[PDB]
Design an enzyme around this catalytic site. Sequence first.
Site, short mmCIF file in Angstrom:
data_model
loop_
_atom_site.label_atom_id
_atom_site.label_comp_id
_atom_site.label_asym_id
_atom_site.label_seq_id
_atom_site.Cartn_x
_atom_site.Cartn_y
_atom_site.Cartn_z
N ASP A 28 -4.44 1.47 -5.58
CA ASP A 28 -3.75 1.51 -4.81
C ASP A 28 -3.35 3.10 -4.37
O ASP A 28 -3.25 2.84 -3.33
CB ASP A 28 -2.10 1.37 -5.62
CG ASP A 28 -1.82 -0.38 -6.21
OD1 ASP A 28 -2.03 -0.04 -7.44
OD2 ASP A 28 -2.11 -1.39 -5.75
N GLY B 66 -6.51 4.57 -4.17
CA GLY B 66 -8.06 4.99 -3.21
C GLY B 66 -8.55 3.63 -2.09
O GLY B 66 -8.65 4.38 -0.63
N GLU B 67 -7.13 2.71 -2.48
CA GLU B 67 -7.55 1.61 -1.08
C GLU B 67 -6.60 1.78 -0.02
O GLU B 67 -6.16 1.34 0.97
CB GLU B 67 -8.11 0.43 -1.43
CG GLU B 67 -9.30 0.23 -2.45
CD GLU B 67 -9.45 -0.35 -3.34
OE1 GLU B 67 -8.91 -1.23 -4.05
OE2 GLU B 67 -11.11 -1.22 -3.16
N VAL C 189 -1.09 4.64 -1.81
CA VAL C 189 0.63 4.85 -2.08
C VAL C 189 1.54 5.61 -2.01
O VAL C 189 3.30 5.40 -1.64
CB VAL C 189 0.58 4.35 -3.91
CG1 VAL C 189 -0.19 3.65 -4.98
CG2 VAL C 189 0.98 5.97 -4.31
N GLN D 187 2.55 6.52 1.65
CA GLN D 187 2.25 6.00 2.52
C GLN D 187 3.12 4.57 2.46
O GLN D 187 3.86 4.41 3.78
CB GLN D 187 1.54 5.28 3.99
CG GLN D 187 0.76 3.65 3.56
CD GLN D 187 -0.17 3.80 4.57
OE1 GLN D 187 -0.09 3.71 5.21
NE2 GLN D 187 -1.80 3.85 3.72
N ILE E 28 3.29 -1.94 -3.04
CA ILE E 28 2.11 -2.75 -2.63
C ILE E 28 2.79 -3.76 -3.48
O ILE E 28 2.06 -4.20 -3.88
CB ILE E 28 1.49 -2.46 -3.43
CG1 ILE E 28 1.22 -0.60 -3.94
CG2 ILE E 28 -0.04 -3.05 -2.61
CD1 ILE E 28 1.38 0.26 -2.16
N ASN F 236 3.31 -6.85 -4.08
CA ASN F 236 4.87 -7.52 -5.77
C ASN F 236 5.59 -6.30 -6.99
O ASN F 236 5.67 -7.09 -7.19
CB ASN F 236 3.96 -8.27 -6.72
CG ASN F 236 2.65 -8.37 -7.16
OD1 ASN F 236 1.74 -8.36 -6.33
ND2 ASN F 236 2.45 -8.91 -8.35
N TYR F 237 3.64 -5.24 -6.83
CA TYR F 237 3.67 -4.17 -7.95
C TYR F 237 4.96 -3.07 -6.81
O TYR F 237 5.42 -2.91 -5.85
CB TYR F 237 2.41 -3.27 -7.48
N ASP F 238 5.51 -2.42 -7.88
CA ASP F 238 6.88 -0.93 -7.78
C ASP F 238 6.22 0.23 -8.63
O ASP F 238 6.51 -0.76 -10.10
CB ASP F 238 8.08 -1.29 -7.18
CG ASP F 238 8.68 -2.56 -6.27
OD1 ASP F 238 7.99 -4.07 -6.98
OD2 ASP F 238 8.89 -2.69 -5.64
N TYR F 239 5.47 0.73 -8.44
CA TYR F 239 6.14 1.94 -9.17
C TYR F 239 6.42 3.55 -9.31
O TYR F 239 6.87 3.49 -7.59
CB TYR F 239 4.65 2.24 -9.30
CG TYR F 239 3.78 1.32 -9.54
CD1 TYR F 239 3.02 0.53 -11.43
CD2 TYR F 239 2.93 0.82 -8.54
CE1 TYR F 239 2.10 0.13 -10.71
CE2 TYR F 239 1.76 -0.21 -9.05
CZ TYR F 239 1.58 -0.99 -10.37
OH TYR F 239 0.78 -1.67 -10.74
#
Lengths: 620, 620
Positions: free
Chosen positions: B290, B292-293, B296, B298, B371, B373-376
Site C-alpha cells: 500500500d 510502495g505501489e 497511502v 494520497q 485503499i 476494502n482496507y482502512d488503516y
Amino acid sequence: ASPFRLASAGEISEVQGILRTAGLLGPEKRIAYLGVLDPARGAGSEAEDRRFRVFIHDVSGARPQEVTVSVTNGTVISAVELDTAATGELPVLEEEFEVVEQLLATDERWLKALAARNLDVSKVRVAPLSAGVFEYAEERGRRILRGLAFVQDFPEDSAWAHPVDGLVAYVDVVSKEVTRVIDTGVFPVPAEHGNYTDPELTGPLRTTQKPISITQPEGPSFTVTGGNHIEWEKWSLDVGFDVREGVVLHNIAFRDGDRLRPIINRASIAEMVVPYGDPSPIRSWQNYFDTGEYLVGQYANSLELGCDCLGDITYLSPVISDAFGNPREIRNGICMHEEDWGILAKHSDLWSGINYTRRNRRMVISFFTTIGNYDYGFYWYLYLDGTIEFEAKATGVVFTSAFPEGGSDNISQLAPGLGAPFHQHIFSARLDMAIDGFTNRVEEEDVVRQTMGPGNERGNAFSRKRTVLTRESEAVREADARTGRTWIISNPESKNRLNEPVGYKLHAHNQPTLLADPGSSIARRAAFATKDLWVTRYADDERYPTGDFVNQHSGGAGLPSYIAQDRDIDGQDIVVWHTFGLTHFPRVEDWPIMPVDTVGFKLRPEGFFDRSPVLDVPAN
Amino acid sequence: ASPFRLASAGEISEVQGILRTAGLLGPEKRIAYLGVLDPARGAGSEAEDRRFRVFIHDVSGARPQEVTVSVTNGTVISAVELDTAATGELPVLEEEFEVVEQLLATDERWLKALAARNLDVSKVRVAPLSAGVFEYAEERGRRILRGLAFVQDFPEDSAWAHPVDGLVAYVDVVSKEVTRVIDTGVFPVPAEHGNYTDPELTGPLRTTQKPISITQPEGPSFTVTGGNHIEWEKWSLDVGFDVREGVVLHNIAFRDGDRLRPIINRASIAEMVVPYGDPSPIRSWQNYFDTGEYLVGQYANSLELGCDCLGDITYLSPVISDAFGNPREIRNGICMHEEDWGILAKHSDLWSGINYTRRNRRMVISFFTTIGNYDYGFYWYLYLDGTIEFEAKATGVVFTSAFPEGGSDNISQLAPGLGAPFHQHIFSARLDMAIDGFTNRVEEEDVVRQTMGPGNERGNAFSRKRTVLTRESEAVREADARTGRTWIISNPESKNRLNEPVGYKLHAHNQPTLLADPGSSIARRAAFATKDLWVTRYADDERYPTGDFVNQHSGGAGLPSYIAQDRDIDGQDIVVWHTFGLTHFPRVEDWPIMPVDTVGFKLRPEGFFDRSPVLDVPAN
Ligand SMILES: [Cu+2]
Ligand SMILES: [Cu+2]
Ligand SMILES: [Cu+2]
Ligand SMILES: [Cu+2]
Ligand code: NA
Ligand code: NA
C-alpha cells in the site's frame, strides 16, 4: 438478593459473633484471613448459604485453625487445627511487621553490625519481609520475618535511597526473638537522597500542562445494582473483593439478543511473585508472594478523585476484617468508570459511497495496592466488541542495594553507589471458564508454515493448527511467539450459525517466564511461573496455583499437585491459569520513583458471535 | 523559516511551473509521485535548498522520468529517463484504477465468464489490484493491474459480501488492453448482504451509550509554530507528510535541562505489505504494497470532528500534487491532540508518611487511509516519560472469496458460502536514529539464565548480555521472545552521569514475520518482512526497504542490497528498520465490518537521562 454480593460489615461482625460464641475467638486469637466463599456449583433452584472461610492464628503459640462459618444459619460448619510445618504458615499479620525493627533495636549482634558502619539505630528502618523456606531447620513450623536495613536521615526522607548492604537479620515473630544476624561485610551507604517531592531534586515544577477535562453530563452508561452487579453495553458481571486476591470478577457474561451468554465464571489474579536474581547471600532468599503471603487486598489504597481515577467515577468501598474480626471499610478502594477507546470500526467505500465510523469504549474496574516500596495497579477492561483484558501497572520505588565497585552481572546502578537487583514480577491469572456454559475445551493454536511444492506452487500458502488439550497431563503449555501460539477456549456443545464451536482466544504478551534454575527453591515454590498456561479440571478447593498457605511452605502444593490427577478437561468444567510477567533490569529513569510499566493479556471472541456484536452501536 | 516545513500549494504549483518551462510536463505527462526532499546532512551554517523529487509517467508510452527540482532557484537539478523493466514500474496512478472495470465490460472472455455464472455485467464491480511479478513474460516493462469481481446488487450494497470466485483478469493500463482472462470454474456467489448500516441487519440501534465529553478549557498544552513544528512537555519535533509514507516525524528531540537532545532524526512507516496465504491460482499473486505501489498518503481520509478524533484537536491539512501538478489539499488529514494516560507514578510510603501520585499523558499524531476494502489508522505517541510509540489500527471490510464446500486450510468462513483468505499485514518502520546525535550503535540484549552452582548456590541468579552489531552483515536480527530480546540504540560518545552510554531500548511485540516460503516470490520482493530488525549505515538514497519502485519489480532491491555493502555501523550514522505485523485468520466477528485490531512497537529510554525525567511534573 444476589449470593455474589460483597461482604457487608454486618456479616463480618456476625462471623466474629459466631466464632466467639463457639470459643474460637478468645482474646489470644487473631484473624489472619477472612473471606466469603463462592456459591457451590449447581446452586440454582436452591436458596443461598453465605459461608465465610477464616484462618485463626494463636499468639500464645497453639496450633492455628481453619474455620468455615455459615452466617445464614449462625453456625460453625467446620473447625480444624492446622499443622503449619506440613501445610505452610498462615499469611503474615499486619501487627507482626512492626515487631522486626523493635526487637532488632535491642539485639547486640544487630547493634555491633550498625556500630561497625557508624550508624545510629534510631535512624535505621527495617523492611520486614516474608521469609520463604531454605537451609534453616529451626524455621520449619515457625513464623519468621527477614529484615533489611535502610537509613532514614530524617522523618520525611526516602530510606530506599540508603540501603545498608551486607546485613540481614531473621526474626521469630511469635516467640519474639532474633534467631540470626548475618553480616557479610561493611558496604558504603549510598549517600544521595531520593526525595522526589524536594524542590532541590525536582527543580521548579512545570507550568506547561493545561487541564484535560473528562466528564459525562448525563452520567455513566453502566448501572450498579445490589452493591456490585454491573450492566454495561451488553456486559453483565459482579465485582467481588477478597482480601487475598483483591478485585475478583464473577459471572462475566454477554447479552446477545435476548440470551445472556456466560463467558468467564470467575476471574482473578490468584498469585503474584517477585523473584530476585541477585546471588548475594543477603538477597538470594527474596521472594515476595504479595497475594499469597501478604494479602494484597488488605493494603488496597483509598483512591482519590480526579487524581488516581479520572472522569465520572463510581466507587465501591469493600469491607474486610481486621485481626480481631471487626469490619474495616476500604473507602473508595475500587474505581469503576468507562472511557473512550478511539475508533471501533471505520470503512469509507468507493462503490457504495457510504462512509462509516464508530467509536470504541471500555469499562474499567481497578484497584491499587501498596506493599513496602512496591505499588501495583490492577485493571480489568471490558470492550464493546467482546474483548476482555487485564493489565497490571507496576510503580513505586525500586528495591535497592549497594552497587559493587567493579560492577555486577545481577544489579544495575541508579545513582553513585546505589544498586537495584534484577528481578521479575510474575502474575497468575486464574480464569474459571464458562464459554457459553461450563462444558469447555482448550486448544493450542499455532500458525503453520508450508513448503513451496505441489498444491502451493507460488510458495505463498500458510495455515494454522489446533491441538486439543484432552487431559491435565498434556495441559502445561509454553509460549511460542514465533509461531503466534495462542489458546482457544471453546464449548464443543454450543455451535455458531456456521456450525463451529463457539470460543474465545487468549492472547499472551509472551514475556519471559521464571528464569531461576529449575532445581532452585523458587522454581519449586512458584512452579506455576515456569510455564505460560495451565489447564485444570475445576474443583472448589483448587484456588491458588501455589496452594492455600504460601507463607514458608515448600513444594508439594498448588498446580503441579493439581495436574497430577490427570483429569479429563475435554468438554468439562475447566480452569485456565495464565502466567505472565515483567522482567526488570532497573534503569536510571526508574530512580528515584519509577514510572508505570505494564503487563497483561487479553481474550477476544473467536466465532463466539454470528457476526460482529457491535453492528448496533450508533453514530457518535 | 524551517526547512522541514510542509510543502505549500505555492511550492507545488512552482514545481509544476519549473517542469513545464523545461519541457518535462507537456499534456501527455503525469505526476506519479511528488515529494519534498529532506535537507542533506550537515546543512547547518548553510541556508536551505528546498528540492522536490518527481516521477513523471508518459501516457503515450515513452519512458518515464525521475526529476529533481529546486524550488529555491527555480531550476531542474536533474532529469533522467527510467528503464522500468530493470528498476520497476512507477506507482499506480489513481486515474488507471477506473480503467480496469471499463475495459473488462467489452471483453468477450470476461462476458462469457460472467454469462456462465448468470451475472449482469452492469452489477459487477472490479477491484483493480497491483500485479506484482510472476511467470507472465509479456508483463515485464508493462503496467498491469489484476481485477477481481464482486457483485453489487444495488448502488448502496457492499459488494465485498458477493465475491465472484474462480475468475481473475489481467489488464494493461497504458495500451488499454485485456491481456488475460482466467476462469478456473464457477463458484456460487455468496448470497447474504453485509450492509452494516441497514436496520434489518443492525437491529434497533443502542440507546444505552451516554456521552463522554473530553475538553480542554484552556486549550492544549502543545504549540504549533511554522505550520508543523510541535513543542509538548519537553518534546520537540516536526510533523511532515509524504504522499508515499504518510505522516513522517522529523527531529524528535527532548529538552533535558537547557539542552535539546536529539533522539530520532526521522521516523516513518516506509513500507507495508499484505501477503495472502491462499494457494488458489486466483489469489496466490495478491500482495498489496500500500505504501510502495499505491502511495497511502494520497488516500488519507479527511478526519471529522468529535468522531475520528475526540477532544481538543489541532489539524494539519497537508498538500500534495494531483496527476497534473496542481496542488490538492487533504483537509483535516492529520490530527494532533493530547490525552490522559492514567497513572505515571505512584508511591505511598509508610516510613516518610508521604503519598505521591502523578498523571501520565501522551501526545498523539495520527492519520487514516483507505485503499479499496482496507482502512488503516497510523498513530504516533510521545509520552511524558520519554517513551515513543507507534501503533497501526486495521479495520475496513475483510477481503473475501467463496468458502470451499469441504472446507479450507487457508480460508475461514464468515457467513454461508463466504470465505476470507488468511493473510498478514506487515509494516517496516524506518527509524533514522540520532541518540544524542548521529554517532549511534545497536546492541541486541537477551536475558541470560544461569545454572545453580558455584556463585549461584540458591539457583536464583539471572543476568543479561548485549552483543554489539558492528557491521551490516551481522545486523539482520530475529526476535526471541523467550529470552526477552530487545535492541538498544546507544551513543558510545555520550555518557550519563554514571558513565554509561546513553540509549533507548526498542521493544517489539514479537508477532510472526513473513510466513511465505523463503524461495517464494513474495519472500524475495518483501525480504525485509522475513526478519524483525535490520540496521543500515545511513545513506540519502536508501529510503525504502523494498527500493524506490515496488510496482512490478522483483528482487535485486532494498534492504538485502543495502546490507551487502557491509558498512561499519559501530558508532556511526545508522538507521533501524523494524518489521512488525499482524497475522489474520479472519473470524466471524470481523464480518461484515471489522473491529479495530492493532500492532506496533515502542522505544523507552535506557540510561538516556540521569534520573526520572518526570520529577518536575506537578500534582493534578
Ligand atoms: Cu537521605
Ligand atoms: Cu521491577
Ligand atoms: Cu447484496
Ligand atoms: Cu487482516
Ligand atoms: Na470452568
Ligand atoms: Na542515523
